[PDB]
Paper text:
For instance, the U5 snRNP 200 kDa helicase (SNRNP200; Brr2p in yeast) unwinds the initially extensively base-paired U4 and U6 snRNAs during spliceosome activation and releases U4 snRNA and all U4/U6-associated proteins, necessitating re-assembly of the U4/U6 di-snRNP and the U4/U6-U5 tri-snRNP after splicing. SNRNP200 comprises an auto-regulatory N-terminal region (residues 1–394), followed by a helicase region (residues 395–2129; SNRNP200HR) composed of tandem helicase cassettes (N-/C-terminal cassette, NC/CC). Both helicase cassettes comprise dual RecA-like NTPase domains, a winged helix (WH) domain, a helical bundle (HB) domain, a helix-loop-helix (HLH) domain and an immunoglobulin-like (IG) domain. Only the N-terminal cassette (residues 395–1324; SNRNP200NC) is an active ATPase/RNA helicase, while the C-terminal cassette (residues 1282–2136; SNRNP200CC) is catalytically inactive and serves as an intra-molecular regulator of the NC helicase activity.
Residue numbers in the entry:
A (entry chain J): 2070 to 2335
B (entry chain B): 403 to 2128
C (entry chain C): 5 to 58
């Protein structure tokens, strides 16, 4: 469609949402862990997002010394992906790299087109599938952070899956908006904080780019990729949409009658 | 400072530009008639009769001019009339000229005559031209004319060996273009923008001639460029007093005398004006003016007008028709062909085949593939830009042979190629101007050039020209073509931009300077002549005859306009101007101030590509661009196909500009003429506009927007999106191949891995695979690797190694490739540091190292990103993450010692009465630092460390320690160490006059020689030495008892451990500590240094307690320091230096107007250059000799002592300069003048900062960067040199504060303040210079095994600093185990290196023992690498030719300086030396020292710098040669040892071995040798013992000149020896053989050897050698010094054979011809 | 008795160009080995990526 232009124009103004970021305050249980997300990576992750299509990124971090309850998030890993407004499709292979062996997986963060009072069934299904496929993701350590786009700002909330949630999500095969057997008891909300005390970093695929929304046919759930230390490109970067730049008939006799003036300063 | 009123410049400007006619009525020649037919009326002006030749007037034959000018005029019988008139003024006088002649009269040949004059000023000798002595600038209005000028001048001036070239290209392409060529042909805009960028700065002194071709362009909108250029040139002529000749070529138009006045042309001599009667071919111009109003009929009329005019000349004259646009050419040709064919078939004779008399050639040439195929058979043709290159030359050649009867063309034909025609018809005269945004009449210059082609010079009696135009514009062309259109100035419109350019260049500093600058503009002359035309009333003119007030008002308005747009900071009060970054960028890229304001408002860090295109579209250069109704469907269609979205409606002009630029980059096809013109205009401006945006964003440090802007600049340049395949940039690839390559979803980086077969198969076509592979490996590519080491907790030192990884091709990559080095933070949002990197073709596939400092912060970032991005290649970036995960920042350092507020200490505090007299007169009280430290230093006996900024009287603390030592013992021994020899001499004279006189204590200064040092140490009480001399002396401290028993060891400037030559100081200090450990009588150590951040480490290393460590903050200095830093953002160092000359003078005026000033410059020549520049800049100002503070008469006696002519001239004007080449007497005299106050400015080179004792008020450090030719790069000053330079600003008595101005690149500005306002951290570099000291300790048996080496390293400052800052020393941990492992690895690698070079021997794996190579390396204090080189290269057959090379390759010469332009001198020298060098690298210091050694041996004459380098080389030559002799003797080879001895004895005398022995006699030349040779004398003895009368008869000279010659023979070695074998009869095989040699000289020694051509004072050295010549074996050798008599015994083992003979050699090292040899035999028994 | 070293260089016995080339070769290879002995200052980037081996 030709509607990507208005979306690109809107996404060019995502740095304005960066100023106002609201962390949801709730009835915390304070029995499990608490997670600290540095503001710089959140700012960049919002800036590279799109209002209509969700993007996702794996969370990697470590617990600081003599304080195991808190979990500092140190890295956000962007992987080849293509997103729908209600779900994000990302490959089965979890990111692996020498730089990430020291740290541990803490979950994944994804943007959301609109504010939702409850965690979407697609998110719990995806998290349960990831946990089932990979034993490295602990049931209680991993979380889901949803960064909804409120009017003029963005509110982000963390969630955790109960064992019943894992049990239901692993066997779930329905991609509908309201699957059967889904109840709020599956997930629990987890306290999280933003901080400027420390800085995080990004990791992006070594080959090509992390975004396959435009080149959808090239994305296959079984694809393999390698990571690197680099900052991600914006959603509507030129690299991400080659079908708009590459295909162009190169003129030969177009310039035969081109107007002639001398570039004196050249 | 008048009451300025603001004038609106928009009112004053002449609208409609070049079409403004100040002419009132335009009366026309006598023959004329206006007749009307149908819708128009014609005006005819008959051709003027040529002016008859005057009396005694005749054309000049070519043979009648100077002989050198004869070449360059071949093929011409005679000069024409105009050239005949002008040849005298052009060739004989060096006077400014203005030639006003009708077009086509041969003004280019007059310009050629002026160029030949300038060339003849350099005829050199033997018919050669000094190519590098001059440059000529030829300014031409059109590029198509520039190319033809280049071609023609290359053809004409070929025989002179002179290269002419166009100036087009990138600035760094033009930088190497200009240096290559001698004649530069360029447009006014190109030359102006190059001058604005500063690219003309380097060669501006070589420009002697400037030619302003078609100078009547002043009337055009481009005229302000000419005014700026000429005014700048003339004003610079006045400013620098240099002479530049300006030649102006113009058409015959009114106000020519005003142009002559503007060009500084004398009307009586240099003004030549010729009317239309002097045109070579009479021209019967005809005008037609159409009165039709509606466009369709008016255009319909013109067709039959051209047809009717064509039919007149149908069968007899080649008609040439011009059309406005490229497409109109074919349309007009087809229209005229159809019109002539359809009616009555006029084409029959219009072609006139005459039964194919001529048509056959065109019928043969019909085999084309264009629309020219249709027209050519009928005789018509079209010539326009485009077509094909072959088609244009085909049509040109076919027209030159009178085949094409009618040729319609565009305006480029007239400018490009000289193709005259009998008749020319100008059709339309209405062109579309994209800048104006509408249809405008075409320029006057174009009309003149196009109508100057009417009539062929020799085939035409008279050629007419028809001009077709609207009747409303007929009078303008009547005026223009009949020399009645005045040349007016257009400067008012562009005044603010040119004023900003002048401010940025630094030419104008305030309003007065701007008024003076306007005084030279053509606008000023025009306002003077015609005030009423320029809005000046006659009474206003009477008010001020010189128009001072009006010029000031104009300047005030321009300054206000610039200030409003933030281009300049201008205050109305003083009228001063301050350059802003926006102003600099606008000047460099030639953009108007409104565009700069728009960019400043709109640009933001968070800008995206959409808003970037929006910002570009909102530029003010496009203010006249509007969207038209007809070009709306096409714009709408293009809107969907462009990639970047546009958030504006199509009706706005900004959206049109944006989508148009995108369509250009996307290479879309456009079908509108106006649309295509707009596209061409916007895209040609886009280069400069986007480059300016990129510079702005880069300066503000916005990384994310910087990347986008640079990529967009590259996309506009290459006309392709970055997503496309990078191989498109090589235009040789087929389009299909690249399209297929990028069709596959493919990463470009994968192509590197594949070979040529896989690349071909991968594209499903193997035949192209090899070419694709070649082009892939031609693509630029760099490999990055960083070794960063933390300096302090807030800064990191990063060295980046860039290694090219691509095959270099001259045709593709050009002379050089440019890259941008960017380091960014984690988020890639801010640029921490950036710098321009230029890769040279000759230095390709060489590793380049770039060192810079980046800051860090408390929230330690996870990593930094280092990006190296190509300047003009897409997808040519390399990124290297620099992780900080395992970085260990250095220890946090404790605060400096607090200055206790104590009452000043009286000198009477010292109880002893004798000491008080030393300081009683100097001062009554010790200053606060000395008072605070006094108790500890004077009264306590413990080690003390004093750290204070230089100039705080730290030496008095050492004096306190010395006086304390004197109290301890009546006879004491103190050793004072200073890293610099010059500082050592300064301290020596001070302490000598302080102690040896007042206290009568022995104060001595150590020299290089060892025995003299031992004697001085034995007799002296206060030892003064450098680290190297004391290291030599104290290496064998176990042998020398005097070294052990020293009471006090004072080390000064101990912060220089972190600098070069620091490891020696560290080693000697550690050795003193270790020695004091074992003596059982502690050696007190007093360490004096600058403020150290880590003074605790130094105190711990040297044993100073915490309470006796005084580390003071740099603000404790008694004289407060006012330090200012200026940043000059010029990547080119030469350009930076040249441009920063005037700022030095401005700083002198502002900070120290009447107080002494010291200027520090990097190089030796820069001293003289800067002195001359300061003199010329103050002379250009009103006040001359302001710096001289005394009458010349009293300083006259000082001049005759000087021997430098240039220095004499500068001294008379109050400015001196100091450098190494000056003799010590001259330097001390200039310093005496500076101290006395006679002169207040000295320009000292960087190296002299240590060895200079003068105090000033203001110290100016010019560049803080020097050239290292060994690495062909620039390296900044060490921070210690900067500290020493800054410390010279201390004048405690006269001054109350010390100013210091540090000028440098913009990048270093942040580092300088951080490390100059705070205490300095010092590290250790002993881990790199470890081999020599370990070798020395192994030789002296201090280190006997590996554990000894580890324990030895436990005593160093390196051991202390390894734990404090581990990552600086490549240590990955702080644990004790890590330190032990690293130390063991270091002492393992060093011992392995020594064992590999045979310096030592490692038995088993623990013990180490010295070998002979190590012993001779330690003996002569020579780097072990040099000894290894000698051992590996010397063989049994090396002769002197190889010895020179081997000596040249020693590591002692590794630091011989390499300077700019020395390659030419080295090549010229290598051409002359007796031994040539096979393919030598001229940036290699070893090649240079080989050449200098050969030149010195050949007594060749060299420049002063090369002479000083020769002195430096010869200083170490003798030690190196003695080392070579020892190596050869150890190996047992005899012939090369004798060769080395001869090499020594002939380097001393500076002669080759083949030269006559008598050459070493003083005042002897070849003629004297020639006279001596025939007489039969060949040796010095044969005249030493010869008659005085005969010797003075054969030698003709003054008695004074022969007295020293006779005395030389007295000093010449006259010795003889006797030898005997002790019990030669009782000699058995394998037994010891003792041979005794006794030599007594006869004449007594009167002094040292007489070697006038040698730097140092040599001493008689000898060699006694026993060997067998037959076997070429050196049996024994012993080196000695002979005083008056000597005895030498040589021992060896007798061989098995009973009978053996040996030849006893006796060689010298200072004299030649005194070597003796004797033959003896030994009788060996069983 | 007073015999001197009469010089008979004979233009170094027409010194061979190859002999000088061999001396240059030996010097170049030795200097290359000596340059190979040089150690680097500061920690490399890859070292900070990997840190301690164990």
């Amino acid at each position: 469609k030709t509607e990507w232009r208005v979306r690109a124009i809107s996404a060019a103004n995502l740095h304005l949402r960066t100023n106002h970021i609201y962390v949801s305050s709730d009835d915390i249980k304070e029995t499990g862990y608490t997670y600290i997300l540095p503001k710089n990576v959140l700012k960049k992750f919002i800036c590279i997002s799109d209002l209509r299509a969700q993007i996702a990124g794996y969370l990697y971090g470590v617990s600081p010394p003599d304080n195991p309850q808190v979990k500092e998030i140190r890295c956000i890993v962007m992987v080849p992906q293509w997103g729908t407004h209600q779900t994000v499709h990302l490959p089965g292979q979890l990111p692996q790299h020498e730089y990430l062996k020291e740290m541990e997986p803490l979950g994944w963060i994804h943007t959301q087109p609109n504010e939702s009072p409850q965690l979407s069934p697609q998110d719990v299904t995806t998290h349960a599938k990831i946990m089932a496929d990979n034993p490295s993701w602990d049931g209680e350590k991993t979380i889901i952070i949803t960064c909804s786009f409120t009017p003029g700002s963005c509110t982000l909330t963390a969630y955790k899956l109960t064992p019943s949630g894992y049990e239901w999500g692993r066997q779930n095969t329905d991609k509908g908006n309201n699957p059967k057997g889904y109840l709020p008891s599956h997930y629990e909300r987890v306290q999280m904080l933003l901080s400027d005390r420390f800085l995080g970093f990004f990791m992006v695929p070594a080959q090509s780019s992390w975004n396959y929304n435009f080149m959808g046919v090239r994305h296959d759930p079984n694809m393999k990729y390698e990571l690197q230390l680099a900052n991600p490109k914006e959603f509507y970067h030129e690299v991400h949409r080659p079908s708009h730049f590459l295909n162009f008939a190169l003129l030969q006799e177009g310039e035969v009658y081109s107007a002639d003036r001398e570039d004196l300063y050249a | 400072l008048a009451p300025r009123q603001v004038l609106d410049l928009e009112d004053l400007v002449f609208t409609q530009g070049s079409h403004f006619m100040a002419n009132k009525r335009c009366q026309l020649p006598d023959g004329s008639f206006r007749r009307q037919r149908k819708g128009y009326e014609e005006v005819h002006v008959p051709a003027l009769k040529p002016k008859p030749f005057g009396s005694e007037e005749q054309l000049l034959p070519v043979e009648k001019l100077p002989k050198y000018a004869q070449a360059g005029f071949e093929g011409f019988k005679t000069l024409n009339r105009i050239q005949s008139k002008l040849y005298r003024a052009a060739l004989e006088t060096d006077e400014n000229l203005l030639l006003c002649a009708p077009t086509g009269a041969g003004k280019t040949n007059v310009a050629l005559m002026c160029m030949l004059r300038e060339i003849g000023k350099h005829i050199n000798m033997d018919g050669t031209i000094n190519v590098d002595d001059f440059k000529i600038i030829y300014i031409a209005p059109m590029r198509s004319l520039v190319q033809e000028m280049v071609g023609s001048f290359g053809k004409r001036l070929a025989t002179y060996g002179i290269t002419v070239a166009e100036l087009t290209g990138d600035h760094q392409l033009c930088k190497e273009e200009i240096s290559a060529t001698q004649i530069i042909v360029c447009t006014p805009e190109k030359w102006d923008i190059i001058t604005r960028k500063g690219g003309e700065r380097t060669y501006t002194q070589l420009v002697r001639l400037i030619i302003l071709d078609e100078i009547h362009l002043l009337h055009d909108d481009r005229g302000p460029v000419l005014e700026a250029l000429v005014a700048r040139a003339i004003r610079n002529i006045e400013m620098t007093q240099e002479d530049v000749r300006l030649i102006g070529l113009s058409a015959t138009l009114p106000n020519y005398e005003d142009v002559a006045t503007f060009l500084r042309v004398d009307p009586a001599k240099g003004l030549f004006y010729f009317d239309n009667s002097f045109r070579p071919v009479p021209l019967e111009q005809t005008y037609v003016g159409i009165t039709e109003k509606k466009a369709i009929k008016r255009f319909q009329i013109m067709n039959e007008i051209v047809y009717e005019k064509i039919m007149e000349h149908a069968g007899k004259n080649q008609v040439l028709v011009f059309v406005h646009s490229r497409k109109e050419t074919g349309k007009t040709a087809r229209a005229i062909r159809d019109m002539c064919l359809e009616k009555d078939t006029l084409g029959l004779f219009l072609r006139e085949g005459s039964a194919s008399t001529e048509v056959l050639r065109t019928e043969a040439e019909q085999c084309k593939n264009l629309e020219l195929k249709d027209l050519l058979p009928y005789g018509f043709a079209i010539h326009h830009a485009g077509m094909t290159r072959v088609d244009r030359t085909l049509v040109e050649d076919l027209f030159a042979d009178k085949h094409i009867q009618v040729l319609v063309s565009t305006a480029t034909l007239a400018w490009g190629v000289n193709l005259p025609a009998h008749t020319v018809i100008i059709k339309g005269t209405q062109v579309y101007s994209p800048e104006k945004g509408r249809w405008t009449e075409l320029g006057a210059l174009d009309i003149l050039q196009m109508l100057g082609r009417a009539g062929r010079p020799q085939y035409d009696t008279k050629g007419e020209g028809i001009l077709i135009t609207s009747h409303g514009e007929l009078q303008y062309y009547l005026s223009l073509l009949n020399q009645q259109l005045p040349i007016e100035s257009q400067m008012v419109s562009k005044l603010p931009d040119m004023l900003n350019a002048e401010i940025v260049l630094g030419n104008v500093q305030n309003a007065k300077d701007a008024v003076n600058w306007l005084g030279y503009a053509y606008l000023y002359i025009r306002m003077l002549r015609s005030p009423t035309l320029y809005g000046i009333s006659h009474d206003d003119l009477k008010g001020d005859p010189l128009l001072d007030q009006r010029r000031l008002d104009l300047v005030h308005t321009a300054a206000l306009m610039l200030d409003k747009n933030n281009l300049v900071k201008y205050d109305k009060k003083t009228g001063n101007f301050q350059v802003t970054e926006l102003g600099r960028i606008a000047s460099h890229y030639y953009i108007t101030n409104d565009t700069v304001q728009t960019y400043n408002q709109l640009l933001k860090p968070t800008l995206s590509e959409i808003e970037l295109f929006r910002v570009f579209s909102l530029s003010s250069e496009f203010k006249n661009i509007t969207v038209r109704e007809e070009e709306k469907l096409e714009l709408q269609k293009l809107l969907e196909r462009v990639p970047i979205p546009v958030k504006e409606s199509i009706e706005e002009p900004s959206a049109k500009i944006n989508v148009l630029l995108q369509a250009f980059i996307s290479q879309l096809k456009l079908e509108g003429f106006a649309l295509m013109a707009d596209m061409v205009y916007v895209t040609q401006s886009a280069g400069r506009l986007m480059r300016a945006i990129f510079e702005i964003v880069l300066n503000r440090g916005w990384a994310q927007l910087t990347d986008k802007t640079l990529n967009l600049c590259k996309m506009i340049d290459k006309r392709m999106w970055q997503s496309m395949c990078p191989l498109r940039q090589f235009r040789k690839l087929p389009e299909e191949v690249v399209k297929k390559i990028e069709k596959k979803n493919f990463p470009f980086e994968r192509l590197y891995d594949l070979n040529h077969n896989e690349i071909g198969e991968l594209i499903r076509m193997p035949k192209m695979g090899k070419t694709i592979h070649k082009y892939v490996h031609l693509f630029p590519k760099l490999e990055l690797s960083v070794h960063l080491q933390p300096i302090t907790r807030s800064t990191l030192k990063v060295e980046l190694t860039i290694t090219p990884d691509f095959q270099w091709d001259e045709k593709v990559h050009g002379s050089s490739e440019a890259f941008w080095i960017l380091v960014e933070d984690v988020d890639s949002e801010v640029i921490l540091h950036h710098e321009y990197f230029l890769l040279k073709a000759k230095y390709a596939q060489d590793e380049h190292l770039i060192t810079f400092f980046v800051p860090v912060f408390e929230p330690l970032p996870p990593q930094y990103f280092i990006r190296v991005v190509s300047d003009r290649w897409l997808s040519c970036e390399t990124q290297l993450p620099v992780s900080f995960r395992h970085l260990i920042l250095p220890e946090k350092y404790p605060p400096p010692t607090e200055l206790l507020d104590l009452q000043p200490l009286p000198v009477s505090a010292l109880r002893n009465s004798a000491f008080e007299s030393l300081y009683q007169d100097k001062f009554p009280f010790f200053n606060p630092i000395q008072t605070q430290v006094f108790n500890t230093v004077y009264n306590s006996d413990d080690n003390v460390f004093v750290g204070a900024p230089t100039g705080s009287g730290k030496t008095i603390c050492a004096e306190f320690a010395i006086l304390r030592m004197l109290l301890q013992s009546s006879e004491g021994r103190c050793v004072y160490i200073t890293p610099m020899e010059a500082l050592a001499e300064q301290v020596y004279m001070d302490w000598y006059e302080k102690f040896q006189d007042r206290l009568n204590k022995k104060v001595v200064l150590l020299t290089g020689e060892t025995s003299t040092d031992l004697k001085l140490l034995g007799k002296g009480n206060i030892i003064i030495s450098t680290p190297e001399k004391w290291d030599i002396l104290s290496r064998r401290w176990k042998q020398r008892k005097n070294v052990q028993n020293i009471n006090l060891f004072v080390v000064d400037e101990v912060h220089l451990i972190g600098g070069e030559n620091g490891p020696v100081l560290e080693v000697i200090c550690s050795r003193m500590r270790y020695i004091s450990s074992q003596i059982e009588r502690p050696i007190r150590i007093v360490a004096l240094s600058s403020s150290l951040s880590n003074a605790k480490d130094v105190a711990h290393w040297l044993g100073c307690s915490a309470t006796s460590t005084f580390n003071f903050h740099p603000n404790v200095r008694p004289v407060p320091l006012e330090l200012h830093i200026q940043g000059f953002n010029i990547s080119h160092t030469q350009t930076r230096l040249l441009s920063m000359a005037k700022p030095v003078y401005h700083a002198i005026t502002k900070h120290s107007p009447k107080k002494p000033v010291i200027v520090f410059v990097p190089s030796r020549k820069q001293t003289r250059l800067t002195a001359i520049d300061i003199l010329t800049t103050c002379a250009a100002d009103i006040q001359r000799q302001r710096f001289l503070h005394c009458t010349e008469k009293d300083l006259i006696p000082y001049l005759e002592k000087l021997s430098d002519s240039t220095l004499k001239e500068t001294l008379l004007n109050g400015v001196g300069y100091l450098h190494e080449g000056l003799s010590p007497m001259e330097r001390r005299l200039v310093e005496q003048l500076f101290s006395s106050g006679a002169i207040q400015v000295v320009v000292a080179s960087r190296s002299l900062c240590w060895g200079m004792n003068v105090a000033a008020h203001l110290v100016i450090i010019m560049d803080t960067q020097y050239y290292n030719g060994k690495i062909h790069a620039y390296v900044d000053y060490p921070i210690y040199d900067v500290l020493q330079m800054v410390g010279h600003a201390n004048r405690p008595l006269q001054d109350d504060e010390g100013r210091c101005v540090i000028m440098c690149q913009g990048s270093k500005k942040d580092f300088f303040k951080k490390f100059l306002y705070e205490p300095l951290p010092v590290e250790s570099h002993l881990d790199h210079c470890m081999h020599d000291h370990f070798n020395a300790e192994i030789v002296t048996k201090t280190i006997e095994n590996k554990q000894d080496a580890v324990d030895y390293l436990t005593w160093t400052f390196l051991y202390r600093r390894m734990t404090q800052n581990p990552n600086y020393y490549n240590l990955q941990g702080i644990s004790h185990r890590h330190l032990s492992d690293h130390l063991s690895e270091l002492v393992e690698q060093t011992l392995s290196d020594l064992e590999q070079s045979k310096c030592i021997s490692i038995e088993d794996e623990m013990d180490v023992a010295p070998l002979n190579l190590g012993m001779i390396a330690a003996y002569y204090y020579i780097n072990y690498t040099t000894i290894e080189l000698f051992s590996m290269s010397l063989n049994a057959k090396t002769k002197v030719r190889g010895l020179i090379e081997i000596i040249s390759n020693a590591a002692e010469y590794e630091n011989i300086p390499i300077r700019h332009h020395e390659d030419n001198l080295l090549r010229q020298l290598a051409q002359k030396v007796p031994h040539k060098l096979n393919n030598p690298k001229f940036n290699d210091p070893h090649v240079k020292t080989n050449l200098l050694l050969q030149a010195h041996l050949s007594r060749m004459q060299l420049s002063a710098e090369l002479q000083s380098d020769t002195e430096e080389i010869l200083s170490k030559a003798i030690r190196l040669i003695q080392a070579c002799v020892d190596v050869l003797s150890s190996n047992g080879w005899l012939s090369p040892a004798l060769a080395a001895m001869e090499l020594a004895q002939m380097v001393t005398q500076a002669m080759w071995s083949k030269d006559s022995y008598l050459k070493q006699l003083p005042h002897f030349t070849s003629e004297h040798i020639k006279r001596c040779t025939d007489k039969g004398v060949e040796s010095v003895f044969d005249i030493m013992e010869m008659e005085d009368e005969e010797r003075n008869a054969l030698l003709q000279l003054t008695d004074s000149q022969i007295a020293d010659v006779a005395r030389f023979c007295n000093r010449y070695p006259n010795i003889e020896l006797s030898y005997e074998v002790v019990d030669k009869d009782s000699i058995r095989s394998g037994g010891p053989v003792v041979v005794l040699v006794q030599l007594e000289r006869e004449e007594e020694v009167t002094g040292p050897v007489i070697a006038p051509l040698f730097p140092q004072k040599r001493e008689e050295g000898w060699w006694v050698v026993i060997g067998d010549a037959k076997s070429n074996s050196l049996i024994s050798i012993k080196r000695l010094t002979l005083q008056q008599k000597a005895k030498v015994k040589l021992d060896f083992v007798a061989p098995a054979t009973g009978a053996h003979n040996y030849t006893l050699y006796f060689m010298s090292d200072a004299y030649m011809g005194c070597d003796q040899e004797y033959k003896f035999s030994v009788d060996v028994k069983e | 008795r007073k015999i001197f070293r009469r010089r008979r260089g004979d233009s170094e016995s027409e010194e061979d160009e190859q002999d000088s080339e061999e001396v240059r070769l030996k010097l170049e290879e030795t200097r290359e080995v000596q340059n190979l002995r040089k150690r680097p200052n500061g920690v490399s980037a890859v070292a900070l990526l990997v840190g301690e081996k164990v």
